[PDB]
């Protein structure tokens, strides 16, 4: 509950057969403070591979379990995820991308992970890599929240990454399914933050999207921001 753990638990990254020791320590029966300390020690001793494997095997299933059970993330587990983001390579490749690729991401975890991302400063290279990873996978409902919050992180956006995002938006013309306006909010954020990085054919593509997929309220605002956008 409180105090310090025995220091032999902190020599686990210094070991060679750390997986057997981890299975002995039974991470499924750990408490939130113990997992927070474990993530802190794992992020304080380099070795992005073992941290990524720990997040894939331990932290993400426990987050899924207590979000599905208690309908809210734990306080110490929120700190554990914040500590895990201090090594952003392990956090993106170990928690965010596998949960996005799972296809069963809940909205609560989507909002929690997005708030964690907007709490923190993301590197421009890492943010662009995250953009390219989101834009290349299949469409899901919760992924638009991730893309919108990464977009209103408001970082510099390269050529191929922005074009991949644009063609991800262009991949929706033949879809007759009802679309959320949250996707339109991600689109509006992209237009509002990157109107100077929008070329011509992209702009008429978005106008014909708004003609094909209209919205009573936010689509006029998207039309205004496209029509009053200066290039270059």
């Amino acid at each position: 509950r409180s105090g310090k753990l025995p220091k032999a638990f902190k020599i686990i990254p210094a070991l060679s057969n750390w997986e057997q020791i981890l299975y002995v320590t039974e991470p499924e029966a750990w408490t939130a403070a113990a997992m927070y300390q474990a993530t802190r020690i794992f992020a304080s001793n380099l070795k992005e591979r073992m941290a990524q494997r720990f997040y894939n095997l331990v932290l993400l299933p426990r987050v899924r379990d207590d979000v599905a059970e208690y309908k809210r993330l734990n306080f110490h587990l929120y700190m554990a995820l914040k500590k895990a983001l201090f090594k952003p390579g392990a956090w993106f490749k170990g928690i965010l991308i596998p949960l996005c690729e799972s296809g069963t991401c809940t909205l609560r975890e989507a909002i929690i992970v997005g708030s964690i991302i907007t709490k923190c400063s993301i590197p421009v290279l890492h943010s662009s890599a995250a953009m390219l990873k989101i834009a290349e996978m299949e469409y899901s409902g919760a992924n638009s929240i991730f893309l919108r919050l990464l977009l209103d992180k408001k970082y510099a956006l390269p050529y191929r990454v922005l074009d991949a995002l644009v063609f991800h938006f262009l991949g929706f013309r033949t879809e007759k399914r009802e679309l959320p306006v949250l996707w339109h909010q991600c689109l509006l954020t992209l237009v509002q933050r990157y109107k100077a990085d929008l070329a011509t054919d992209q702009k008429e593509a978005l106008l014909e999207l708004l003609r094909l997929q209209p919205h009573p309220q936010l689509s006029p605002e998207i039309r205004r921001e496209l029509q009053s956008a200066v290039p270059r």
Binding site: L125, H126, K133, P158
Partner: peptide, 24 residues
Amino acid sequence: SSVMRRNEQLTLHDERFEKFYEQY
């Protein structure tokens, strides 16, 4: 990969995107 770009007005960093998905 896309077909169009931002075309002109220079580049700053090409960005290293192959260090994330290539791990797993």
